[PDB]
């Protein structure tokens with residue numbers, strides 16, 4: 001059985017908390033492999049491994065389980081346990097009732113019917129939450145490689161919501177595919193060119209996430225294909241501010257997208273800047289666009 005190392009500690013499949021299959025009930029589907037809402041009463045999301053899979057899919061599934069179980073931070077989704085001794089195999093995650101962040105932003109956009117559905121402070125709180133998770137990964141020398149709204153989750157739809165990093169599939173793949181599947185629109189120049197990844201890789205991606213958040217869920221680089229973005233970014237091109245985006249917030253984005261990784265902020269600095277934005281009345285009193 002494959003070993004996993006995080007923060008200098010080794011873990012094995014033996015370390016995963018096996019939950020007896022009889023204690024687990026599926027309730028409804030949520031969305032390779034399926035995801036279900038479930039009960040163990042503790043409410044969970046259940047990732048399943050198709051019984052029709054390759055041995056590599058099996059190892060991938062096991063590794064995903066090891067990776068998430070070894071994290072310990074409030075802004076990374078918890079693993080309640082696994083059910084690997086019955087088929088189909090389950091990974092049991094903290095149930096994030098708010099769903100993924102991208103879908104949330106698109107669905108919760110202010111509208112004439114829901115004029116005050118979201119405010120700048122809601123977005124800054126989401127940004128801070130994920131930056132805190134990223135800081136934890138950084139200080140533990142784990143490179144996420146795919147920081148993007150689709151990979152973040154919310155505890156609940158409502159005001160007290162907390163955002164967390166919820167998917168680690170890219171990092172799992174790299175720990176051990178094709179060009180058309182790479183998250184090019186979230187990657188820095190040295191990443192897709194030399195295949196060099198460092199903590200500053202995640203800083204660049206966080207910048208793109210920030211744009212996703214303040215655009216309220218738009219796809220980055222509107223109207224641009226992957227190759228067009230690659231050439232755009234490699235030549236110094238950067239996204240414009242999202243609609244109504246406060247200058248101080250856009251400025252964090254543009255610092256995250258510095259060409260030289262040494263010139264980009266670490267997450268401690270990003271968190272400090274997000275904090276200062278949240279204090280600034282001119283930032284948080286800015287109205288988000290109302291989509292007609």
Ligand SMILES: C[C@H]1Oc2nc(cnc2N)-c2c(nc3ccc(C#N)cn23)CN(C)C(=O)c2ccc(F)cc21
Pocket residue numbers: 030031035037045047077093094095096097098099100150151152153165166167
């Ligand atoms: C593996 C899956 O984990 C989870 N999904 C939801 C909630 N909690 C999870 N631990 C979750 C998702 N959508 C909804 C809708 C309603 C409710 C409730 N109640 C929960 N969810 C997102 N999703 C389908 C996903 O696969 C998805 C997308 C991104 C990600 F990072 C993780 C996940």
